[PDB]
């Protein structure tokens, strides 16, 4: 179900990430560094457990989760959120909840590229990831 998402992915296009970060209250200096960063995302599974790593020159994160089971997460911008990841229409949908707020991180495969759509408030960001061999 999730297997075409697995592997190492490199950022190759970003649209509106500053809008998304600003909506979350990320400070200007952080947004500035993050606008030039090209993370690597690694998605691996071991049975029912997925591990999603995001690596860059500015910040690393790692989460492990079971699809459909809530987990605690501390985001790159230090929000303490309640998270759940599920497959929905073949997309990997990550919902974060905190302080009555929500944001979604939706990953889809289109022509072998990984498209990540980030929504918070009215801000919508689209990031495109290609495969690393
Ligand atoms: C994911 C952190 C990776 C480190 C890269 C250097 C900074 C860019 C990521 C964000 C760190 C700055 C704070 C804002 C983070 C917002 C929420 C997560 C968005 C992930 C976008 C994506 O996975 O492409």
Is residue 133 included in any domain, yes or no? no
Is residue 35 exposed (0-12), middle (13-18) or buried (19+ Cβ within 10 Å)? exposed
Ligand 1 contacts CB of residue 92 (under 6 A): no
Q: How far apart are CA 43 and CA 6, in angstroms?
A: 5
Q: How many CA atoms lie within 13 A of 105 on its CB side?
A: 14
Is residue 74 included in any domain, yes or no? yes
Measure Cα distances from 63 to 4, 33, 73, 110 in Å: 19, 22, 7, 24
Is residue 132 included in any domain, yes or no? no
Measure Cα distances from 126 to 45, 50, 132 in Å: 25, 23, 19
DSSP conformation class of 35? T
Ligand 1 centroid distance, CA of 119 (Å): 13
Strand partners, 8: 42, 132
Is residue 61 included in any domain, yes or no? yes
Measure Cα distances from 104 to 28, 88, 107 in Å: 22, 13, 10
Among 93, 11, 14, 75, CA closest to 84: 93
Ligand 1 centroid distance, CA of 2 (Å): 22
DSSP conformation class of 116? E
Provide the token pair at 45. 């599974």
Q: What's the distance, CA 59 to chain centroid?
A: 13
Strand partners, 51: 44, 64
Q: Which of 59, 73, 83 should be mutated for ligand 1, with most atoms under 8 A from CB?
A: 59
Helix, strand, coil share (%) of the chain residues, nearest 5: 15, 60, 30
Is residue 17 included in any domain, yes or no? yes
For residue 85, give its domain range.
3-127
Q: Please count the structural domains in the chain.
A: 1
The domain that contains 87 carries what CATH number? 2.40.128.20
Is residue 55 included in any domain, yes or no? yes
Question: What resolution, expressed in A, was reported for this entry?
Answer: 0.9
Neighbours of 120 (CB within 10 A): 20
Q: How far apart are CA 21 and CA 34, in angstroms?
A: 9
Q: How far apart are CA 83 and CA 71, in angstroms?
A: 5
Ligand 1 contacts CB of residue 39 (under 6 A): yes
């Amino acid at each position: 179900m999730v297997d075409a998402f697995l592997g190492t992915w490199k950022l190759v296009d970003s649209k509106n990430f500053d809008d998304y970060m600003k909506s979350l209250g990320v400070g200007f200096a952080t947004r500035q560094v993050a606008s030039m960063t090209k993370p690597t995302t690694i998605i691996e599974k071991n049975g029912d457990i997925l591990t999603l790593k995001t690596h860059s020159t500015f910040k690393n994160t790692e989460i492990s989760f079971k699809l459909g089971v809530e987990f605690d997460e501390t985001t790159a911008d230090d929000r303490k959120v309640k998270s759940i990841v599920t497959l929905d229409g073949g997309k990997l949908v990550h919902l974060q909840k905190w302080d009555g707020q929500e944001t979604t991180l939706v990953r889809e495969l289109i022509d072998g590229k990984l498209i990540l759509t980030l929504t918070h408030g009215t801000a919508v960001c689209t990031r495109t990831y290609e495969k690393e061999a």
